[PDB]
Amino acid sequence: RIPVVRLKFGEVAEATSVVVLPVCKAEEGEKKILEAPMEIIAGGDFKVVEAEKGWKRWVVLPSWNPVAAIGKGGVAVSFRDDRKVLPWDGKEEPLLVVADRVRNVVEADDGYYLVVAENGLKLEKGSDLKAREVKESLGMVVLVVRPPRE
Amino acid sequence: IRIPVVRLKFAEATSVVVLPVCKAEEGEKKILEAPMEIIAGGDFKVVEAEKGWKRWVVLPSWNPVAAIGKGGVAVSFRDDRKVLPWDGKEEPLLVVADRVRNVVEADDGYYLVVAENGLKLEKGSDLKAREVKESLGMVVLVVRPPRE
Numbered sequence: 001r002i003p004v005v006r007l008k009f010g011e012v013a014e015a016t017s018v019v020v021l022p023v024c025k026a027e028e029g030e031k032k033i034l035e036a037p038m039e040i041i042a043g044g045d046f047k048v049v050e051a052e053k054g055w056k057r058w059v060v061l062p063s064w065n066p067v068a069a070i071g072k073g074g075v076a077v078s079f080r081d082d083r084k085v086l087p088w089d090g091k092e093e094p095l096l097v098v099a100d101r102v103r104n105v106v107e108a109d110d111g112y113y114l115v116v117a118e119n120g121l122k123l124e125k126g127s128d129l130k131a132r133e134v135k136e137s138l139g140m141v142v143l144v145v146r147p148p149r150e
Numbered sequence: 151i152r153i154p155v156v157r158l159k160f161a162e163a164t165s166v167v168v169l170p171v172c173k174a175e176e177g178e179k180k181i182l183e184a185p186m187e188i189i190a191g192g193d194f195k196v197v198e199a200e201k202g203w204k205r206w207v208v209l210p211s212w213n214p215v216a217a218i219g220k221g222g223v224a225v226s227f228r229d230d231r232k233v234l235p236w237d238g239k240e241e242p243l244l245v246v247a248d249r250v251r252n253v254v255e256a257d258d259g260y261y262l263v264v265a266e267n268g269l270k271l272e273k274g275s276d277l278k279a280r281e282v283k284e285s286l287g288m289v290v291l292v293v294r295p296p297r298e
Contacts (some may be wrong), residue, residue: 012203054202
């Protein structure tokens with residue numbers, strides 16, 4: 001299905017290179033997802049990150065292959081629980097979903113997309129969305145991030 | 151005569167510190183409006199601020215950087231001559247300031263101060279002689295760029 005990575009306890013501190021992404025909560029809905037800064041350019045000798053819009057919450061992640069590949073339009077969405085979100089098995093834990101809202105249009109049959117559910121926010125397979133005559137989503141899920149544990 | 155100066159590289163301690171950023175040329179106006187309560191929480195070290203902010207930097211958890219907590223801010227400089235009281239090397243700088251410790255009280259410490267034209271770092275004792283009671287914040291650490 002989709003690539004999923006568990007962040008190691010203290011992996012961010014030991015990393016050589018890092019990406020920074022705006023954060024959204026599950027409860028706060030679709031509105032804050034769209035309002036989040038789209039153009040996140042990092043430059044200079046200090047790798048200073050400047051966004052177009054002001055933002056409140058942020059996440060620091062190591063430069064994973066598919067994550068750094070996004071550039072413009074990257075975002076991370078928080079979840080309290082992994083059950084009502086993941087299509088397959090969960091483990092009853094908080095979750096971060098990295099999305100590329102630049103390619104929000106459904107085209108990949110095997111890829112997964114962030115969509116507004118009749119209740120909150122869920123993850124859908126492209127083929128299932130195509131069945132419902134749904135073309136535009138909130139963005140394609142690039143990576144699912146799982147928390148450090150013992 | 152010298153404040154803690156560190157060259158940036160990518161381990162130092164155990165974690166990481168995120169600081170809101172101000173460009174020096176963009177003025178003191180931005181430095182003061184920058185968010186004060188920059189708290190990282192949850193399983194993922196997700197940073198949440200009081201005010202929304204456009205510029206941010208990631209630094210390793212250096213001893214004097216991690217000690218700040220609230221009021222921490224990083225200040226960009228294109229050059230180091232106009233700012234440092236002693237020797238420069240003609241290069242950009244990040245000046246990490248503790249805006250909580252803004253009151254001039256340490257004689258040997260350096261404080262971030264408004265000049266007529268730009269920003270300066272001034273020695274506490276020199277400020278005290280001028281009867282300058284407040285500054286923009288105490289200079290905690292100076293970050294230099296990575297050496298190629």
